[PDB]
Amino acid sequence: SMTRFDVLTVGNAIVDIISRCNDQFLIDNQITKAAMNLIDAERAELLYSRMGPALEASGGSAGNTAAGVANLGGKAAYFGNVAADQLGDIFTHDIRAQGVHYQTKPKGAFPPTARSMIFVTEDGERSMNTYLGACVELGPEDVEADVVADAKVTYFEGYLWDPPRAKEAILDCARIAHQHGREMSMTLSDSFCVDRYRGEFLDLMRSGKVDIVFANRQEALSLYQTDDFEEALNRIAADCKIAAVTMSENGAVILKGRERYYVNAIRIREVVDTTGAGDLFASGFLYGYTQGRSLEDCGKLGCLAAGIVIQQIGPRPMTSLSEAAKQAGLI
Amino acid sequence: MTRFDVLTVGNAIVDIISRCNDQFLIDNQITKAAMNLIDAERAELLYSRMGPALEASGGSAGNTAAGVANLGGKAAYFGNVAADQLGDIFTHDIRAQGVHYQTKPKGAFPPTARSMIFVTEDGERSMNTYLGACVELGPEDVEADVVADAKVTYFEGYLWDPPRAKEAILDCARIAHQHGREMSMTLSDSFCVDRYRGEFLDLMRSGKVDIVFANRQEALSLYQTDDFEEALNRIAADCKIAAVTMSENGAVILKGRERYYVNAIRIREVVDTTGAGDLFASGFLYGYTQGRSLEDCGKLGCLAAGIVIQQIGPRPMTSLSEAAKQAGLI
Ligand SMILES: Nc1ncnc2c1ncn2[C@@H]1O[C@H](CO)[C@@H](O)[C@H]1O
Ligand SMILES: Nc1ncnc2c1ncn2[C@@H]1O[C@H](CO)[C@@H](O)[C@H]1O
Ligand SMILES: Nc1ncnc2c1ncn2[C@@H]1O[C@H](CO)[C@@H](O)[C@H]1O
Ligand SMILES: Nc1ncnc2c1ncn2[C@@H]1O[C@H](CO)[C@@H](O)[C@H]1O
Ligand SMILES: [K+]
Ligand SMILES: [K+]
């Protein structure tokens, strides 16, 4: 039975730069609200010059998910490329300190470590502005084949389709994972990311390279270019073995063939910062999944972790998810 | 018209913040509630044992300048960072708050100072500081026109650790007083006071410092006494104005024989005490440079301090001017 890892995740290694803003700031700066907005180095400088005093926290969607799995008690690993700089050192420290295996080697100091300027509005929504930096170097050379072979699930970001060579690494992961009887999972990441790579994402699912897909409502609607959510659910269920579809305050639904399992969102005192919600939903789900739990219980664990992360600043819970899961009887 | 209300001078530091259990401090021989100086090797070692962290611009005087600006006052800062990413963060955050900050980095080594701050379940903070580029702060960093044009110049007792910062401070005191401005200092930390007791007393008695900030522990340390009433009597005799904080018991402001007691504000929970004294000084000095009564200066200080301890991060993320308006202090 013994496997070295429950979950390997693969993504853009990013440090977040976080500030609260008013609604007008997003309009003035033509930032798309609630989305991941890619930016070049010049725009990164410009936006930073306009940003208020900030807090820094290690981020990266898949990075956050790996950290969450480790926090819950699972065995996690991560592939993602930073630079040999202070931001890279922060990223390396934080993920390793959480007890995630992280061994991707920087290639030099330039391009520098990716950062995302995340603007949080009063409603708690987050709008991200990401300079990919050293993420553009992630490639097949960064696949630790022994780790993929020894991970129950390898999970990756749709966001990896933006940098040039990351997709080649992911295809290598899929080959190795499936040769060793493991499963592959992806998140659709962002509705505009889906707009960019819709055909390629559908191909990953239909060809069986991806077994388990994570989406939110917006991403699922985007995937099929529909405004009919019921259509989106029917189609996603036909395109992948298992789909986990989140619906913000309305909880989540897990699909497997004709099976549907609806889960409620937890009670929130107040939505502080939604950054990381989907990532931590994936942590909870994948932790449950690799512990042999029912699909419903995987959904419950996802909703618990996501509800915790949106009540704090920072994309990675600072409290014990295992303790919260125990208190909730999810164990 | 004067360009600045408050110029502060201190060690420019980025904070690296994590919550820990009580045993961690014991295992690592970290003095609880204190500023613990560390070398580069110890910084690497402690970081290797620290959990996932959050980074936020810090530096005691940096936080104070940011708080004055937040309240609506006009603030400037002198402090030295390196030409590196942490220095860029520090530079951005203080300038983004509307603080004049023009100190030029001198190189990439030593790198920008950082302090690993461990917050225990009681909200207490224990700081472990590698001074880095702070050791390079000297007289060359004094913007004489800024000192000349600031109502109050305020500095950290912490500046007595790096080698040449005290020379910059003596130059500031000269310029400030030549232009009829006032000088202020904070005693910073009780162990810092133990290190520089005689020098601090000399700054006060010689008139180089006009307004002194202390907490209870610092005041007791200054006179090596267990008697808080003795410490208050003595500190009042040694400086023109003393502002002495007493944590949950508020503060007392002393001027000659005058004493003004002020209450702590009501709080939801002590999340992280980092910055409490810094922000008390922000509120006090903001009030002081707006011509407010010493009691109202104390009340502004207690408001700002009470806000900062209810959040993670040494610099309030909320509007202090709005809070002051709501509390009817402005
Ligand atoms: N292009 C990107 N790829 C992967 N993660 C990203 C991207 N932009 C922002 N993020 C991360 O998304 C997280 C929230 O899901 C943040 O912690 C942030 O670092
Ligand atoms: N407003 C909200 N209230 C409760 N949970 C939420 C909210 N927004 C997001 N979530 C949680 O985050 C997940 C992904 O958005 C959801 O499935 C849900 O569990
Ligand atoms: N040696 C030091 N000099 C000045 N400020 C410091 C020192 N060590 C820690 N600090 C700062 O003290 C602040 C809290 O008062 C923290 O934000 C931290 O950066
Ligand atoms: N427990 C507390 N409750 C309210 N205010 C506090 C507390 N601890 C410290 N402070 C504030 O911070 C200042 C410096 O410690 C005090 O004068 C006080 O105003
Ligand atoms: K969050
Ligand atoms: K604080």
Q: For ligand 6, a single-atom ion, which residues have Cβ within 5 Å?
A: B 272, 274-275, 308
B87 is known to lie in a ligand binding site: no
DSSP A262: E
For B327, which DSSP code?
T
Six-digit token string for B149: 């044009």
Q: CA dist A180 to A77, A122, A140, A145, B85, Å?
A: 17, 47, 18, 11, 42
Chain A's closest residue to B86, CA to CA, is A86
Taking residue B145's Cβ as centre, other Cβ atoms within 10 Å add up to 10
Q: Whose alpha carbon is nearest atom 2 of ligand 4?
A: B248
Omega into B314 within 30° of 0, i.e. cis? Answer: no
Distance between Cα A274 and ligand 5 center (Å): 5
Look up the domain containing B238 and give its range: 2-330
Cβ–ligand 2 distance for A251 under 6 Å, the answer yes
Answer whether B115's CB lies under 8 Å from B127's CB: yes
Are A81 and A106 within 8 A, CB to CB?
yes
Contact B154, B64 (CB under 8 A): yes
What are the beta bridge partners of residue B211? B184, B241
- How far apart are the C-alpha atoms of A97 and B190, rounded to whole Å? 32
Using CA atoms, how far residue B265 sits from A79, A232, B119, B120, in Å, is 48, 53, 22, 22
Assess contact for B63 and B12: CB atoms under 8 A: no
Number of Cβ atoms within 10 Å of the Cβ of B6: 29
**B153 annotated as ligand-binding:** no
- Going B41 to B44 to B49 to B53, the CA torsion angle's sign is positive
Q: Tell me, what amino acid is at A285? A: F
CB atoms within 10 A of CB A84: 16
How many Cα atoms sit within 13 Å of A253 on the Cβ side? 17
Q: Would you list which residues of chain B are within 8 Å, Cβ to Cβ, of chain A?
A: 19, 47, 50-57, 66, 84-86, 89, 92-94, 96-97, 111, 312-313, 315, 317
C-alpha distances out from residue B66 to A59, A229, B98, B315, Å:
26, 48, 8, 7
Pairwise CA distance, residues A204 & B284, whole Å = 62
Q: Do A93 and B53 touch (CB under 8 A)?
A: yes
**Which of B8, B9, B13, B155 most suits a substitution to test ligand 3, by most atoms within 8 Å of the C-beta?**
B13
Residue nearest to atom 16 of ligand 2 (CA): A248
**For tokens 């509005």, what's the residue?**
A121
Chain B residue with minimum CA distance to A48? B92
* Residues A226, A231, A234: CA angle, nearest 5 degrees: 135
**Angle CA A144–A149–A153, to nearest 5:** 100
Tokens read off for B180: 């009829």
The type of residue at B79 is G
Instruction: Give me the CATH number covering residue A223.
Output: 3.40.1190.20
Structure resolution in Å? Answer: 1.5
What is the CA angle B28-B31-B34, rounded to 5? 135
Residue type, A53: P
Q: In what order do the strands lie in the sheet with B54-57?
A: A36-38, A126-131, A114-120, A14-20, A55-58, B54-57, B13-19, B113-119, B125-130, B35-37
User: Number of folded domains in chain B?
Assistant: 1
Distance CA A115, CA A19 (A): 13
From residue A107, alpha-carbon distances to A41, A137, A144, A145, A201 in Å are: 19, 8, 16, 19, 29
Task: Say how far apart CA B89 and CA B77 lie, in whole Å.
Answer: 15
Q: Which of B306, B314, B309 is nearest to B283 (CA)?
A: B306
| Contacts with B185 (C-beta within 8 Å, 6 or more apart), sequence order | B154, B155, B156, B157, B200, B203, B209, B211, B212, B213
In sequence order, what are the beta bridge partners of B15? B56, B115
For residue A52, the chain B residues in CB contact (below 8 A) are 96-97
What's the rounded Cα separation, in Å, for the pair B320 and B262?
Answer: 18
- Give the best residue of A17, A56, A93 to mutate against chain B (max B CB count within 10 A): A56
Alpha carbon of B208 to ligand 4 centroid (Å): 28
Of B51, B56, B94, the CB nearest to A55: B56
Element (H, E) at A200: helix A191-206
Whole-angstrom Cα distance, residue A15 to residue B17? 15
Subunit contact B317:A53, Cβ cutoff 8 A: yes
Ligand 1 cavity residues, CB under 6 Å: A 11-12, 14, 16, 36, 59-61, 64, 116, 128, 130, 157, 159, 162, 275-276, 278-279, 315
Q: Are A56 and A91 in contact (CB under 8 A)?
A: no
- Helix orientation angle between A191-206 and A229-239, rounded to the nearest 10 degrees: 40
Residues 6 or more apart whose CB falls under 8 angstroms from that of B147 comprise B7, B153, B171, B172, B175, B176, B179, B181
Distance from the Cα of A57 to chain B's closest Cα (Å) equals 5
The angle, 0 to 180 degrees and rounded to 10, between the axes of the packed helices A86-97 and A61-72 is: 30
- Verify whether the Cβ–Cβ distance A97 to B66 is below 8 Å: no
d(CA A214, CA A226): 18
Backbone dihedral angles phi then psi of residue A88, each to the nearest 5 degrees: -60, -40
Residues in chain A within 8 Å Cβ distance of B56: 55-56
Q: Whole-angstrom Cα distance, residue A323 to residue A264?
A: 20
The answer to whether the CB atoms of A54 and B96 lie below 8 A apart is: yes
Sign of CA dihedral B157, B201, B180, B164: negative
DSSP string of B217-257, one letter each residue: HHHHHHTT-S-HHHHHHHHHHHSSEEEEE-GGG-EEEEETT
Please answer whether residues A287 and A73 qualify as being in contact, where contact means their C-beta atoms are separated by less than 8 angstroms: yes
Question: What count of other Cβ atoms lies within 10 Å of the Cβ of residue A33?
Answer: 14
Name the residue of chain A whose CA is nearest to B47's CA. A93
**SS percent in chain A: helix, strand, coil, step 5:** 45, 20, 35
Cβ–Cβ under 8 Å, residues A197 and A219: no
- Give the Å distance between the CA of A258 and the centre of ligand 2: 24
> Which uninterrupted H or E stretch holds B291?
none
**B308/B276 Cα distance (integer angstroms):** 6
Q: How far is CA B61 from CA A121, B166, B190, in A?
A: 29, 15, 17
Q: Evaluate whether A19 touches A119 at the Cβ level (below 8 Å).
A: yes
- Ligand 4: residue whose CA is nearest its atom 14: B277
Whether the link from the prior residue into B316 is cis, omega within 30° of 0, is no
Structure tokens at A61: 């969607």
Whole-number Å distance between alpha carbons of B60 and B154: 11
Classify residue B265 by its DSSP letter: P
Collapse the DSSP code of B260 into the 3-class scheme (helix H, G, I; strand E, B; otherwise coil) and give the result: strand
Distance between CA atoms of residues A264 and A56, nearest Å: 32
Rounded Cα–Cα distance for residues A2 and A4 (Å): 7
CA B95 to centroid of ligand 1, rounded, Å: 26
Nearest to A36 by CA among A125, A96, A108, A98: A125
Strands A5-10 and A76-79: parallel
Report which residue type is found at B18: S
Q: At what angle do helices A277-290 and A295-309 cross, to 10 degrees?
A: 150
Maximal CA-CA distance, chain A:
56
β-pair partners for B54: A57, B17
* Chain A hits for B94, Cβ within 8 Å: 53
**DSSP string covering A111-135, please?**
SPPEEEEEEE-TTS-EEEEEE-GGG
Q: What does the alpha-carbon distance between residue A220 and residue A252 come to, in Å, rounded to a whole number? A: 12
**Residues ≥6 apart with Cβ < 8 Å to A299:** A244, A251, A252, A253, A254, A261, A262, A263, A285
- Going by alpha carbons, the residue nearest to atom 4 of ligand 2 is A249
